Amino acid sequence: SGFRKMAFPSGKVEGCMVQVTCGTTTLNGLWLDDVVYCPRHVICTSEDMLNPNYEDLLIRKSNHNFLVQAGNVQLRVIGHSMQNCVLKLKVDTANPKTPKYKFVRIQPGQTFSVLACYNGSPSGVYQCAMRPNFTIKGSFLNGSCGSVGFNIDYDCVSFCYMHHMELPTGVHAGTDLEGNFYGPFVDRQTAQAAGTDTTITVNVLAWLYAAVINGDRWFLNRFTTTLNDFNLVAMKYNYEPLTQDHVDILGPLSAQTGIAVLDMCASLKELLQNGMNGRTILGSALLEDEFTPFDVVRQCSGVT
Amino acid sequence: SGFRKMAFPSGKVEGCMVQVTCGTTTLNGLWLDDVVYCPRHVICTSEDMLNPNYEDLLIRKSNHNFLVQAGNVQLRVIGHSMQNCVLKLKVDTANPKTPKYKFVRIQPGQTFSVLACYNGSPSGVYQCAMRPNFTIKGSFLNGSCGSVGFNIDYDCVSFCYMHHMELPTGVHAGTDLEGNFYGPFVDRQTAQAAGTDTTITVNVLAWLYAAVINGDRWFLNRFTTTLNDFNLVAMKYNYEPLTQDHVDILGPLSAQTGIAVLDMCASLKELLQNGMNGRTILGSALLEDEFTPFDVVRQCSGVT
Ligand SMILES: CC(C)OCCCN(Cc1ccco1)C(=O)Nc1cn(C)c(=O)c2ccccc12
């Protein structure tokens, strides 16, 4: 029992972190096989970041201008290319610690772990979610660009995020491992505002199921609702609309607890309308939305 | 910017996890050098757990009765001994992945990361704190015994916790790596109640400093207080008393923000008395106490 915000074990990703330096700019890179992936803004000077033309700036860079250091040893760069907002640096040595991996582009509401790194060295690991406005609420200081987000399925690491930027409001933006930004963000120092950060409804419901499984049941009410009635309330409270696909995904949690999905929706509707009244659920005084239904099943069953 | 509950990178500890089986009981072990450390109740059957006499039960066990599996390969046990509530199994092979390490016994209020494991395989990593009642609020299912808690200082892992038990209230109890339980708990299936789980005041203050550093400043008030006046309020709200040692530890955070420690105490006093009024601090609707002042400095400075 007990329910914690849990990150994946980070070892498989730690073995991939390298430092990439171009000129006087240093950030993190991800070394998989004989390729090092890093944010393309490693080629920029501070002055270039106001309005960079990456294709033009890249012309002034050769293989020998990219310094890649894995631990305290230098990797030889034998090729380089730009794919969207990431640079792929071909090195002469395959990473001996390369885990089985995939590159995946996640949808909003999906969670993942971030291994925050500085100078190619891991500092910590935390769990977060792709917000519905395509930002993440991370913990990133200068030098953390190139840190990655991932999920693990047994022995395969699915990389889903690479850190690029902080918006002026302190929220974070980045790309998938193909270099495509999540959301409308661009790698340029121009003020970019985020859209509404709505609450991930299917994740709140999953966490209410986790709470029932662990014995926090005070919020269970005597009501039910429909998807349409619930969604009227969800819209009022800036919660994402609940679809039958979300209901389907909650099926195993509904089966384990015996609480119909629409009954849990009605309990969540009452929590939104009445508030918590100074009470807590799983040690939180607000409704947690960074656990997917799969995370709850995984944590409550002990998948390794 | 951004402030997250961050665990240490778990790779160095992942390389130490093994599965230990004795008879039909299986749990996790920690392999450092040529010794595997695990909870002594691996020698017990379910019936023995009601009132075990470990010294007597251990007489019926030889080296060949302990099965230690590291990955999918078996380690040869060449010696065994009981130290308090842990068994030390001497193996014929030093763990090639043994990191630099120390065994430390932490004080209440100190935080650490837990690598939850099942069958010697890591499932996840989370950050928690030794509560003032010497329990931890973890996330542990059957099979998680032997999972460890640790802190990392550059390349040295300081192991501070080994998981042994869940109390009937769903909170967790365990030992240091010398086998001494934190608190008064015993490894026997007898109902054991925990004392008052008070809030770690110095950690709440540290987290209020982290909030100011990241721009959440609404709670900053126009008051100051004294240690004695603050402690009258702390006692009323089941907060640990604040000492001058805690004030000393908050010094670097006071210096960085320009907010005197006693001024932050007065702001915390007003939050305790007025509540949050539906507002949040660092995305939390309650006062967080599982960040030490050192964790805040580390996270806000980017120590790797
Ligand atoms: C858009 C994201 C990716 O980067 C944002 C941060 C960009 N950097 C850091 C960086 C990345 C590569 C090379 O330098 C940066 O120096 N920008 C600034 C540019 N200029 C001209 C300023 O005057 C300035 C003033 C204050 C703070 C930042 C800046």
Ligand SMILES: CC(C)OCCCN(Cc1ccco1)C(=O)Nc1cn(C)c(=O)c2ccccc12
């Ligand atoms: C005290 C801590 C360490 O262990 C608590 C759990 C102890 N175990 C598991 C275990 C560890 C080693 C061997 O078995 C256990 O089986 N106890 C029970 C004993 N008996 C006799 C019951 O009837 C019973 C009924 C329901 C649930 C648990 C038990």
